[PDB]
Subunit: 237 residues, 4 copies
Amino acid sequence: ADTIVAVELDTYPNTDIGDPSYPHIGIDIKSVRSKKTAKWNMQNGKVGTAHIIYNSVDKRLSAVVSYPNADSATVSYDVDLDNVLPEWVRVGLSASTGLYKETNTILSWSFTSKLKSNSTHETNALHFMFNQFSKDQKDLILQGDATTGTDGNLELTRVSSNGSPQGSSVGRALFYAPVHIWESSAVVASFEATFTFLIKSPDSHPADGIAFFISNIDSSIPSGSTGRLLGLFPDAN
Amino acid sequence: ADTIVAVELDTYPNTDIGDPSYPHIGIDIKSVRSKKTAKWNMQNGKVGTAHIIYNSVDKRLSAVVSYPNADSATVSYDVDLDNVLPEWVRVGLSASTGLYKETNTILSWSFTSKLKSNSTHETNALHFMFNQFSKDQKDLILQGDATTGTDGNLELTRVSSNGSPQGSSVGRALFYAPVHIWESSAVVASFEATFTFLIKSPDSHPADGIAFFISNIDSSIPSGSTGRLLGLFPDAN
Amino acid sequence: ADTIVAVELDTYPNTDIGDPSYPHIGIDIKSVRSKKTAKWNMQNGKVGTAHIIYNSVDKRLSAVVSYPNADSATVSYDVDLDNVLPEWVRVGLSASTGLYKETNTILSWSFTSKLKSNSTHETNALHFMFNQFSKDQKDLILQGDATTGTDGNLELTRVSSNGSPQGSSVGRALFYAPVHIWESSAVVASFEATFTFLIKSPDSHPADGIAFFISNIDSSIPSGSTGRLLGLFPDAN
Amino acid sequence: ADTIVAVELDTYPNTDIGDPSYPHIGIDIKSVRSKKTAKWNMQNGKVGTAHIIYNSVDKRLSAVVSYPNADSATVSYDVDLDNVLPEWVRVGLSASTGLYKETNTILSWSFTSKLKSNSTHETNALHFMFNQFSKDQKDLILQGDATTGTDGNLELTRVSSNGSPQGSSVGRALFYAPVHIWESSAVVASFEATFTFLIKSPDSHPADGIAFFISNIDSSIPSGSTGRLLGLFPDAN
Ligand SMILES: [Ca+2]
Ligand SMILES: [Ca+2]
Ligand SMILES: [Ca+2]
Ligand SMILES: [Ca+2]
Ligand SMILES: [Mn+2]
Ligand SMILES: [Mn+2]
Ligand SMILES: [Mn+2]
Ligand SMILES: [Mn+2]
């Protein structure tokens, strides 16, 4: 089905499916059951920043999530992405709410993929940066309940006009152009993703999380992937 | 119809339609009849480089075409692009051959659009760089006879297996993602395009030229735009 | 003496020396008597952003100063910088206070110089970005009363421990490495400067202003260049 | 003494000091006795490209050396650079010749250091790119026999007017500005270095090699560091 590789900012601990007993960041390879996790001291109502990095030489997918004036949370996992993802992929953001809710607002998003060939001065690159979103953001593919424009932000899950987050919501935002992650002549290949988010909930138990993902080009929201499955996976296997 | 703004590398002088009596570079705004031209000392069989620049403050579209070890050709035209092009556009390359022919090979292509808002640290940007093309270049829209892959280059017009350019050929290559050229909150907006080309013909009178263009998102090759019309315009008005 | 080219954010109108009757931005070429000015609706206590741009093709030095939620101020002047500045220069920021005062705080500073040769794929570039300053900022040359470190900012003029700006202060910050602005093989040359500032004064008549400048490598603060002369010029000619 | 961390392109095997029996690339931490090496199929007279990368999250210094149309050589070593290098350093290139010789020509050099803070949108960066060198390259510190200008290249070791490399030569080129490699508020820190070189010798046994290095700011050529010690180390310990 959809080949998924994602870094989840999981706000709700579903221990029955492997989530530890606290908010956390995790590296998911084809499954919602993180291959590796790290405790995340989430701050309700605060704007945070997540950094995802990876290069073909070291073969390690790492993420660093921090908030201003606080210590960072870091998680790493050794994975040869070439062995998992197709040649052409699409990058994006996903978020959902189940019985519990939260806003899943994106205020800025930037990505950069580089492929360096063995040729003299040969380098292929893509780089997008959104520091503000428009009502008609033509270079983005919105799936589910995701919308842009509301005071220049990307609302991944449904937020009522009064500012209250809705439950049972799922939405994803993908960049319009496919990204070339593997090249036969490439000696070095790497990508860098960064985004500022704002998880806010009037409850003491927000859910379910935000996730940066990389999938096959024709990826779409799996059925009933609201809640714990973050709009990325079809089941909890 | 198609809103076209292009910088043409016109190899053949069609004096009847306004072309001066020699190879040249020109700034075309909605018409093949350049609004401004500059003599271009073209070098058959040599790899050249073209630089196109524009910013919303100065409001001047400029281009610089040079070859190694030779002097450059420069042409500028004052134009408030906002008054000519839609909010969302698509960028690309076009080329054609008429009774006379030439190869219209692209070896590298890079583009960069920036939109700076009046907000603190707010900047939206897009940047692509192709230093090599693949047979299946999914992030490119090929129209007409254009193909990629042949020793990693983009062949805009038909070139036979033995390396001979075909006449009456037209082809264009557009980047997959739409580019946002105007933003309501932008204080400064600008774009930079650069490409290395290789015009080669066994004849002493090559034709018809290469052109970097910016059009409305759903642009396609006009009918009978081979030859002098460079695959951009439908007629010579 | 010192070859100076600067974009001044002049907060105090010294009409006797050519300043119009209001706060303004101006392009100074070798003299404090701006060659071109534009009214600037300054906002005391608000963080602003200034954008300075220039390229060798268009030959126009432009600046755009804005504040969040307000309209921008823009000023342009046609000047072939090659005819004014030496081959190697140094870039920096300057600020002063006279009988009237104000804080001249810099919160971020970035610069980018590019020189493109007529050679295939040849480009020389420099780019620095300061989004925070340290007490020991070794890559900066501080002259006068300028200091860094205070909550990660660059204080160009003296600010007492209680936060009050001192009068008769002058200070400048220059990047450590000389910048190459002209190259004999360059077909295109350009630079981009951007900085966020914070002009704040307890008085209704702040003075004297901030200025981004480009000088000869061994530039230093002229004598008695406090006040109206912004630490750039020795006299009011 | 000088804190040295370097990636050596060692053309001559000095087995007595730990060099394997063939040309190779190696990661040297404070000693010429590489902490890790990889066989390098060097090509006399061909222009090559070396890529050095490192980030504070993964803590792995890697290098990739390739030539057009050939397979690459890669070597990696896990090292927390913070534990080895001072806060402020200087980056550069070094090369030497002993009883055997070779040209140690640099045709292009680029470096990029990034420091991302835990603050929203805070990033400090430096980036230089030399695609050509001038006779008076003011932003470079030349030590030893290194010179720039000769057809726009950086000659690290002495090359006679007729093009013949001299033995017993040592020269280094350092960037003028100190680089900040550690910051107390940084969540992620990383640097990327790339350079095209040309090792050419009329002999079948060229020596001694090229090396990209990072040292303490006031670094200079150790005495008698010609030959096998590549101008970086004082002895073979
Ligand atoms: Ca969960
Ligand atoms: Ca023509
Ligand atoms: Ca004044
Ligand atoms: Ca050796
Ligand atoms: Mn989880
Ligand atoms: Mn024409
Ligand atoms: Mn003034
Ligand atoms: Mn060795």
